[PDB]
Structure 1
Amino acid sequence: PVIEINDQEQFTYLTTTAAGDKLIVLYFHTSWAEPCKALKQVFEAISNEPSNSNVSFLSIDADENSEISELFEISAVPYFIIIHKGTILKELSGADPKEFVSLLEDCKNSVNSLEHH
């Protein structure tokens, strides 16, 4: 499942020690910037999609996890940050499903060092 981040140690483990070679999606949200239910359902489908089996989805309340928010200098939610091997690959402001899927596909291509798509 999508993992809800509520602790700094937990976050560190999931983004480093346990991240391996997987793309890590950091989703920043707040109660005042909550996406409608239908939208949430669309993203739930994306997270459950079998082709993203190897992508780690981390959900972070930016107001409740201020240390993490400040670390990434979060300036607008909703927001996504895609990481790989301890570095940020791409960022995306907003929750447009199409834009997110594009960004995710771009990141998958970026980390395939053997064949250029």
Structure 2
Amino acid sequence: MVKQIESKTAFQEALDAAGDKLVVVDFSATWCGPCKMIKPFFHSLSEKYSNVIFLEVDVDDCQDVASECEVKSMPTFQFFKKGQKVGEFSGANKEKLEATINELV
């Protein structure tokens, strides 16, 4: 299920502990409408794909992580495999989220 990130150290330690597994990070903001609309579906994906790690970073909480990951739209999903970014898109598109997970797993 979804891991809540509350520091840059925790973000890095998570990308390390993932090993060979795909990591999907949702960068979101609480005030932003599309973020709220997609949160339940992002949590259902985490129950459906045991083999993929799902992280949530609130950009207001972790402005340093947000800045460093160069986020500028919400939600933004970034995909990582062994510390490397292998995909990214923004917008609350359900079909695209899952289709990207299936391409990258």
What TM-score does the superposition give when structure 2 sets the normalisation length?
Answer: 0.91
Cα distance in 2 for partners of 1:40, 1:72 equals: 20
Equivalent position of 1:28 in the other structure: 27
Sequence identity percentage: 30
Give CA-to-partner distance per residue, 1:37-70, whole Å, 9 cap, x none.
xx43222211111xx1111110000121011001
The answer for the alignment partner of 2:63 in structure 1 is 66
What TM-score do the two structures reach when normalised by structure 1?
0.82
Q: Which has the larger radius of gyration?
A: 1
Shift of 1:86: 1.2
Q: CA deviation at 1:79?
A: 0.7
* Large movers: runs of 4+ above 6 Å: none
Report matched runs for 1:1-117 at 5 Å.
1-16=1-16, 18-33=17-32, 34-36=35-37, 39-49=38-48, 52-108=49-105
Question: Counterparts of 1:100 and 1:93 in 2: how far apart (Å)?
Answer: 10
How large is the Cα RMSD of the aligned pairs?
Answer: 1.2
- Specify every segment of 5 or more residues in structure 2 that has no aligned partner in the other structure, as ranges: none
Residues 81-111 of structure 1: per-residue CA shift (max 9 Å, x gap): 0000111110011121101001111112xxx
Which protein has greater RCO, CA pairs closer than 8 Å, 6+ apart? 2
